[PDB]
Each structure stands twice: as C-alpha cells, then as structure tokens.
Design a protein around this ligand. Structure first.
Ligand code: CKX
Ligand code: CKX
Lengths: 587, 600
C-alpha cells in the first residue's frame, strides 16, 4: 500500500471537516448498532484533528472508551464504472468503520493508513452514511502500551508510560479513492550509488511498463517488466519514474518520485552518497494548540520555515509515524528523517512521583509474545508505506526501552533481525534511555548506529553544568569504544518557560537553556563518534498532568504557538555557522 | 448583487480545491503581468497553504509587511464523468484583489476581499486532463477600496500600506477554492422571506431566478416530510403551522427547489428558518418578543493562518461562546466565512452582519507624526468610494440574504460623522441598503467621539450601535467618572432617537497574567471591574437591548506604541485561553434568563 496520487486515478477528499460526533460513555454503540441510524444527540467535529481539545471540555478531553463519527457522502457520478475504495490516512489507536449498515473496515494502529474496496457497497451518484468507531485505549498488546484501570465505580481511566498526551480521534486525511480496474497494490524501488543504479517491482493485474523521467520529465530511461536495473549519468534532486500498467482494456498510470538514495554505515561515519554527515535538527512532535495531533498545512509550512531559518537539516519523527505529507516535503526539500514507530513506553523505570504497576517488565503480565507480534506489525506497516521515500534515512525500532530486566534481548533480537529482513537499504537504530548507560545496556549490539537521549545536568546532575560536562564526556568515550559506532544524540534539552530570566543561570531560565545546550555542544565538538545532534523538541507540547510538567513539556526551543526562546538564536548561530553536513571541529 | 448561492451537495457536485499546497511567489517589481507569469510554471516558488494568509506562514517580516502582487498556482485534473455539465470555479474569498488564469484564459476578476466570486468556465476546460490555475492577489488599499487606505511609496519605490483600522491587513486566499459541477439547467439564485403573526402559522414568500427551466418547490421538515409545495419562478408562497426559528434552538426547514428542463433536472436544498425580526420603539423583536443580545465583536484571526478559515477553530470558538453564555455576535469589520453563518443558522446564533467599511475616519489614530484634511472630499472618500461601498453592501446582502441567523445589516463601523458630507455620503447608502433587503434592520456602528450631541447620520438607521470606552481612552483608570459619563450619554442617545441601543464594543486591554491590587489599567482585575460597572449602567437604561464586549480573543494589529503585540482587549488570549474576566461574563450571561434583559 502507498499514498494515492491523482492522474487518471481519482479521489474526493473527505476531510470535509464537520462530521457528526458523539461519545459512547455507557458502551451502547455496537449493541444498538449505531451505524444503522443517524447519531442520536451529536455535535459537530472537525476531521483533520484530535477530538480531545476541540470542545474546551475536560470530560471529553480525559475521556476513555468508544467515540463515534458519522458523515454522509454523495459518490461522484463518473465512477459508476470503477472500484470505489475508502482510505483513512490515520485513525489514532483503533478504528472500525461501517458504510451504510455494512461493516467494511477495522484497524489497530494510530499512525498508519488503512483502506478497503467498497465498490460492491456503493453506487455512484447517491449518498451513503459513513460511521466510524474510534477507540483510544492502551493495553500491553498495543503500540504504544498502557494499562486501563477501572475504579470502584466502573469508570475507566487510562494509564500509559510515555511523555506526550494520549490524543486520539481522526487525526489525518479521510479519502475516497478510485483507480482503474486492473492495478491495485504496491510498488517498490531501490537505489544505488558508485562512489547510479535502480530496481523495480510492481504488483497489479497485468503487464507493466516503467519509464524514469527527470525533473523536466523527459524520459531518461525505460524498461518494462516487474524487475531489472536502469542507470543514470541543501535540498535534493528527485527524479520521477512513471510506472504504467498495460492490461485488460484499461491502462493505469502511477507516478512515483524517486531520489538517488544510497546509504549504509561505515565504521564511525554516517555516510551519505559516500559522504560523512552531521545530523542537525530536532526531535519533533505532532502537537498544536487546538487540533491536538491533527495535521494542518499551515503548521507544516511554518515549522519548516522555522527549521529552515534555524539551520536544521534533519529531524526525527519522535515516537510515532508522522503525516506522510511531511516526508513528501522532506523529499522535495532534502530533509534527512529518522523514521520511528509508535513503540514508546516499554519502560517502567521512568515514571517519577509519590504513587501498582507490573513488577517484571518482560513477562506474560506485560510485554509478552502478543506484544512482540503487534510490535512487528507496527514496524511492518511503517516500512510498508514509507519504503520508497528518499527522505527516510534510517528506521528506529523503539524509543527509550528498559533493557535492564531479564528477557529484553530475547524480545528485541527477532525484531531487529526481522526489520533488517524488511528493508536492508537503510540502517537500523533503537534510541537509548539515560539509565541504560554504556556499562548496562543489553541490546545496543544489534543496531547499526546507536542513538542516545541524555539529560545530564537536568534529571540527574541537579543543575550543575560543571560536573554534567565531565559525566557526559566519559560516557561518550565509553559508548564509542564499547561499540565503535556513530553516535547520534537524538534527545538533549531542558524545560525552560519562555520569560523566566535569571542572573544566576538557574534551571528553568532561558539563560540555563542556552548555557546547557552549548556546553553539550562543546563536548560534541571533542568526540570522534558523535555524527548527529537533534535537540529535545522544537516546540513545547502537551503531556498528561503531573507535578513534573507545567502545562506540558516545556523543553521546546519554541513555545507551543511557535515563538522563539533565546536558545533559538543560539542554535541558529551554530547550525548555520558550520558548513552543510560537516561537523564543527574542536577549537 | 450578482446571483450566487452556496455550493451545496445534491445529485450534482463539487470537488474541493483547497489542497493547501500551492506554488507561491511574490512579485517585487511587477514583472508578473509583463512576462504574463500566468503562461508558464511559476519561477522560483515556495509552498503555501490555501486557505491561509500569506503573511505569517514563513516567519519572515519582509513577506509579512509586503505590499504589492503575489502569485499562487496549482494544477488540477478535472474529473471526466463531468462531460456535458457546467463547470464553475469559485473562490470564496481572495482578500482585496484577485484575478485568475485557467492556464492562459482569464476568467474572473474581483475587488471584494471577503465575498465569493465565480464564473462559468465550462468552455475553457474539457474533462479528463489537468489545467494550471494561476492567481494574482493584490493587497493594496486606496480610497476607493472597502476598507480604504493609502499606499505610500518611499524614495526608493518600496510600497508600504497605511490604513485606518485597528486589525492587521492580512491578505491571500483566506477561504475555500473550489471547482463545482451543475447540470446545464441553472438554479442561479433563490430568495426566501418569512412572515409570522402570533406563532401559530404563516408563510414564506419566495422568488427565484432559475435561468433554465420550470421550477417546483417543496418545503420539507427536519424529518424531511413534505409540509408544503409550490409551483412557479416566483410567488411560491405556502402557509405552515410551523416550529419557528428561535435563538436557543434554530429550527431549519429545507426549501428543496427543483428546476425541470426538458431533458435535465437540477435540485437545490436551501435551509430556511421561519423567523421574523423587527424593531418597535426601543425593543428589538424576534418572533414578536423582545430580545437581549449577549456576546462579542469577533475577528477572523489566529496564530499562524492569519484570517484563513479553519474548521477546528470554528468548532472550538463556538464551544467557548456557548459555554460563556453568548447568544449573539457581530462579524466585526468584514463579512465572515459563510461556514460561520451556516453554523449560527443550525445552532440558533444571532448575527449582526457587517461589511468591510472600516477606517472611514481620520480622527482615531493618535501619535507624534500626512493624512488628508477633508474626509469626505474628491481626494479621499469620494463618489467612486460611495459606489464601491454600495457594491460591498450589494455582495454581502446577495450572499447572506436567506440566513436566519443574520438579524441586521451594518453598513460601516465607526465612521467620522462630524465633517459635512458625512450625511451626504451615508444617506443614499442607507436608502439603497433598505431597498436591497427590507426584511432586516439597518445599523451603522457609532464611534465614541461622535457623541449624542455631535453625530450626524444616526437618524438614518433602525438600531443604534455604540462603541464606548469611557474609563479607557478617556477618564483613563477612573471608574467613578466613567460610570457617570456613560450613563448620561446612554440616556442622551435614548432621548435623542428612541431606538434600541446595542453596545457593540466595550472592553479594555488586559495582559493575561498582569494582576494588581490597585485595580489599575491593563490588569485582569481592571477588566473585571470595568466590564462590571458597564453592566450596572446597561442594567439601569431602558433602551439598551444588547451587549457585545469588544473582542472574544486578542488579535494582531499594525505596529504601534498603543498595541502591545496586538490588541489585548480579548476575553481570551489569541490561543483561546480565558482571562479572569471570562468567568465574570460566564456568570452574567448564563445567570440571566435566555434572551431577556437583566431586571437590575
Ligand atoms: C529522561 C527521559 C527523558 C524523556 N525522553 C523521552 C521523551 O519522550 C521525553 O519527552 C523526554 C522528557 O522527559 O522530556
Ligand atoms: C475608540 C475606537 C476603539 C476601536 N473601535 C473599533 C475597533 O475595531 C478597535 O479594535 C477599537 C479599539 O481601538 O480597541
């Protein structure tokens, strides 16, 4: 499965915004089969957006259970001789959908599309009732995991183990799509460099021809057959190889953009086209002021303008798969992307407070075999749909897992190996949490380049930069000599509320963010193996409520409404001072 | 105005073209028209989101303050199952000036920044292939624009736009772009008007221009059960025993007009609410019952889209207004996105509909630095200006005529009526508006300094709308003098005109977080105290039938020593968080009985 693009392939975008929405507090929907009649006592909701914060209501915001969307649609008239298929680009956590009293789809996965042919349940020209049942619950076999808890009164409350807030709803595009009656499924392409080759595979209903055209889209070379190899002689050139499906009586044309993408890892260097690289940029989040994680074109354009100004050339889709629009953008603009799945919270050592969670991390009570297989499904879907993007430069299996407990490597080994089985073109990482240090972590052996999320001077060095530097440097050198891999610091940052200034350079002040980030920068400058720096969050984002979070995680370089803290000008001076992709040497 | 109805979905349809990502480029030296950029793909472009203002999408002050022409562009595949159908391309709002090319054929031109414009473009496309849409957008204001302004060119030829309204002059394609298909039998326009007597029964006269054929109509129920039927291009009266459109509820029948040609059919559903507005003495009646307006002057303004319409923003802002107890609002200083008038229609929100005629006043800006000396004059507000204004009223009424939520038209906001020729200007505009729609009252929002003994034009309008700021811009910080001045000025207006009085703006700048024990200006405590005193005075004047505090949220403005990052008069911050006064109003507005004036 890959993204619908239009040519003699058509669609009616159904991000019509306003659907009928209703909560299901007493779980009556399935039994009264609500999809059967117009929702009783509904309210208007926006459909590219989370349902949590759109109504300024704490009881919808913290709601756990089943919610219901509904929307009627007229199917276009020129589709009577076509297959009508219905695609949701992201339903966060779980979705099941009924096209007029007949059930059509079901899917467990919050950041990946799922589609299904409904041509035998539609006829072009008339109006059908679409009803969606969305679930936002997490158990130990979900990606990410969690524990629902039902109190004395029967009220559900969801507990989880990741920082960001558990936003849910229809966060991305809904889509009615038609394609000619022979070509259905997937295409895959792989690219090589010689210090200039390709490959093709199409799955459709008949003969296939493929022609690579360039940005002027004049044909630069053509083959036809499911496989073989053509050759050819800040932001990146994207050719376009146009694959055609000659068969039955109708032809089908699909355009797939390809970039000359190359890379594996070599010793201590993350090369690109046989070129050393330094990652600069951010751990991101899909989080905005009123839409939750809902995608929005304005926000995307503005935050790319911000990363462009600040000099970042890369980022990482922190803790879940992102809106594909962003990877198409990264394609055209030459942004380097670390693709991560929703597998966060595999750790019960991070929660901090005054408050019964399972005692053995890897076991049947928690992360079991079912968990490992749901995980492998998540990696499967992320690779299945982002495989042809040039901007995806590395896969990341999970984020900050607890690898101290027994059973950790028995769990993660088949996943690393299987993912290498899923695509050998790009490297494999697993971002490492602070407390599984160099002397302790179990799984770093299995990955190509190890990524570190370290916060010396914040969570563990009590605001004392002068010792934090020393600790961070030992640990740096230790990691490299233990694995002689490239080191990408994927998370590093401190909570700072915009407006707090202090002569004493204290924690939470803007001066402290500046000083802390630049001391980290000084040690980066001095160790061979660090090939990347991505600060911990570009903007402030929302989290669940707790004594550690003042209205959200304030570790951002920008505020939630995208206004710059002082450190935004620190980074801008450093990241645009170096030349592109090259690390500042030691002074 | 020219015939136009909202594109609604029947067995003939529309395909959304706000795909957001278009090619955008500014035209710094007007090379665009000369090289007719409309001919080839835009040279040196960057991605823009549509709909949204272009000013703040790139976090760059040099685009933000840019004056001149900008260029949007996008290819489109026209669906082929549309062959033998009329294809129309509608822009719902291109702010200030826009003209567009279907690759090389130019199709439309428009100077109104907040009202739609379309053109039948069936002979310039054929279904199945993809054509390039190129749009030229101008953000310049002169004295014949609505609103007016003065572009001024420095020594170097760079433009800088000067204007005389508070809010910032956002531009771009702010609303929906859209290709839509209709059968070759045209239902070009519909007009519906409602009457009632004692809530028991009456009728909805009707008129329709349907360019191509016979028309029958059926008014259907919320159950879509037929409750009456008509026949004819006009007349089309039927009588009912209905459940009529009321503020708290908003019951909407559906007028299904069908246009039978000899081979083609066309179906249009137009939602109607059975409401009757009028004014009698000092009372604003709705279904023959006095009404009390509560709520806000609003704005189309958010943190990164400028004035771009956004569904989440609409849903969340209605959630807040509903919580806070607001029952009404007015589309402050320009026509709003029709989505909002449909929302108000379905939910029973009462709306004062206003045109973009702000800044007809050179007495409001205050500072230390060349504006014309005669407001009404050939160099400034001129005859061309008056026809431009009459055109703006023509489009707004043409587009929001059948909405039950629209309860009153407002021609302009805070014009200076002191100079002679103010009444010469506004009188024919008031009379013309009255003939363009006799169903709803006519207002013209009154500025603080054209007081009751000074104003010239209020004679000409049905309901008096006051923007008062005693205690803020004058009597600054003194609640005891502001109360007296306000109360005698209110009583004065009542003695002079015996109209209903709606206080359509009253508010103070309040920094969220700034608290004070001394109840001084800019603190949240001052907002509460100030609004609260104003509320005692309203409660003590017979003729005041409405209160709309000045601004629901903080919004952006031009830069100046009076605007701290914008106008801070909102009850909510720009990111919709409530100041302390937000709970003051919530206590009042849900304490009173719905639609009733507090009895003191
Ligand atoms: C010491 C663990 C740090 C933690 N790392 C994972 C991110 O998802 C969180 O945002 C970050 C944080 O605490 O902000
Ligand atoms: C005395 C004029 C007040 C003025 N009235 C018009 C609004 O558009 C402005 O926002 C408001 C203000 O200055 O706050």
């Amino acid at each position: 499965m890959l993204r619908p693009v239009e040519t003699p392939t058509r669609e009616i975008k159904k991000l019509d915004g306003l659907w009928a929405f209703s909560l299901d507090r007493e779980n009556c929907g399935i039994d009264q089969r609500w999809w059967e009649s117009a929702l009783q006592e509904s309210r208007a909701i926006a459909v590219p957006g989370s349902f949590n914060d759109q109504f300024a209501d704490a009881d919808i915001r913290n709601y756990a259970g089943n919610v219901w969307y509904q929307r009627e649609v007229f199917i276009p008239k020129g589709w009577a001789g076509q297959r009508i298929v219905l695609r949701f680009d992201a339903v966060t956590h779980y979705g099941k959908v009924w096209v007029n009293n007949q059930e059509v789809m079901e899917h467990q996965g919050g950041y990946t599309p799922f589609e299904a042919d409904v041509t035998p349940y539609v006829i072009a020209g008339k109006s059908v009732r679409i009803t969606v049942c969305v679930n936002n619950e997490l158990n130990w076999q979900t990606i990410p995991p969690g524990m629902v808890i039902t109190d004395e009164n029967g009220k559900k409350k969801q507990s989880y183990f990741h920082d960001f807030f558990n936003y849910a709803g229809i966060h991305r595009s809904v889509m009615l799509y038609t394609t000619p009656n022979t070509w259905v499924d997937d295409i895959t392409v792989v690219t090589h460099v010689a210090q200039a080759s390709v490959d093709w595979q199409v799955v459709a209903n008949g003969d296939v021809s493929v022609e690579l055209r360039d940005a002027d889209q004049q044909v630069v070379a053509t083959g036809q057959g499911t496989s073989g190899t053509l050759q050819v002689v800040g932001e990146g050139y994207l050719y376009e190889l146009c694959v055609t499906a000659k068969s039955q009586t109708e032809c089908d044309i699909y355009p797939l953009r390809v970039g000359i993408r190359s890379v594996a890892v070599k010793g201590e260097q993350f090369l690109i086209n046989h070129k050393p690289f330094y990652f600069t940029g951010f751990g991101r989040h899909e989080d905005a002021d009123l839409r939750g994680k809902g995608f929005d074109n304005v926000l995307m354009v503005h935050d790319h303008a911000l990363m462009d100004w600040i000099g970042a050339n890369s980022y990482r889709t922190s803790h879940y798969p992102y809106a594909e629009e962003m990877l198409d953008w990264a394609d055209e603009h030459g942004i380097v992307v670390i693709d991560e799945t929703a597998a966060v919270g595999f750790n019960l050592s991070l929660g901090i407070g005054f408050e019964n969670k399972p005692k053995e991390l890897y076991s049947e009570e928690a992360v079991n075999g079912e968990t490992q297989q749901a995980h492998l499904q998540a990696i499967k879907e992320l690779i299945a749909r982002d495989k042809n993007h040039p901007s995806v430069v590395m896969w990341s299996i999970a984020n900050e897992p607890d690898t101290r407990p027994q059973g950790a490597r028995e769990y993660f080994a088949p996943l690393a190996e299987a993912t290498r089985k899923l695509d050998p073109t790009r490297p494999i990482t697993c971002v490492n949490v602070m407390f599984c240090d160099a002397h302790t972590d179990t799984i770093s052996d299995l990955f190509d380049v190890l990524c570190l999320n370290r916060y010396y001077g914040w969570y563990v060095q009590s605001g004392d930069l002068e010792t934090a530097e020393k600790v961070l440097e030992k640990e740096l050198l230790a990691w490299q000599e233990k694995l002689h891999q490239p080191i990408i610091i994927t998370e590093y940052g401190v909570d700072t509320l915009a407006g707090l200034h202090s002569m004493y350079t204290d924690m939470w002040s803007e001066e402290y963010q500046c000083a802390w980030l630049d001391m980290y920068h000084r040690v980066f400058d001095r160790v061979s193996a660090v090939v990347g720096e991505q600060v911990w969050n570009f903007a402030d984002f929302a989290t669940s409520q707790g004594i550690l979070r003042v209205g959200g995680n304030k570790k951002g370089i920008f505020t939630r409404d995208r206004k710059p803290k002082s450190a935004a000008f620190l980074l801008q001076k450093r990241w645009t001072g170096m030349n592109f992709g090259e690390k500042p040497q030691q002074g």
